[PDB]
């Protein structure tokens, strides 16, 4: 029932279009049940990984300015404290 044998069988077909109907008919249950429910597997299922697996710098999100080639409103102790279009500034918490 190998695919190569089936393809070799196809090669025996020799010469208006017709929509023909196939003649194919569309133990086994025991094998399916054993595979689904009672077969220990080499690879651990997600249920056991759910039990044995444990999950493990702001300067990295910024952009450093590029090099430059030139050849070919309020205040406080001298420091700005409020940005433009804003009303508070910064307050650590």
């Amino acid at each position: 029932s190998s695919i190569q044998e089936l393809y070799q069988s196809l090669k025996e077909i020799t010469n208006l279009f017709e929509d023909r109907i196939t003649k194919l008919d569309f133990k086994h249950a025991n094998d399916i049940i054993k595979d689904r429910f009672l077969r220990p597997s080499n690879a651990l299922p997600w249920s056991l990984l759910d039990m044995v697996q444990d999950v493990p710098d702001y300067k990295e999100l910024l952009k450093v300015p590029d090099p430059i080639n030139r050849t070919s409103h309020k205040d406080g102790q001298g420091l700005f404290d409020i940005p433009e279009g804003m009303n508070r500034g910064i307050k650590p918490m």
Binding site: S1, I3, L6, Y7, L10, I21, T22, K23, L24, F26
Partner: peptide
């Protein structure tokens, strides 16, 4: 095309 059932059905069509 690698499905066995599809190739079997096509073979049984003719």
């Amino acid at each position: 095309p690698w499905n066995v059932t599809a190739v079997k059905a096509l073979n049984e069509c003719f």
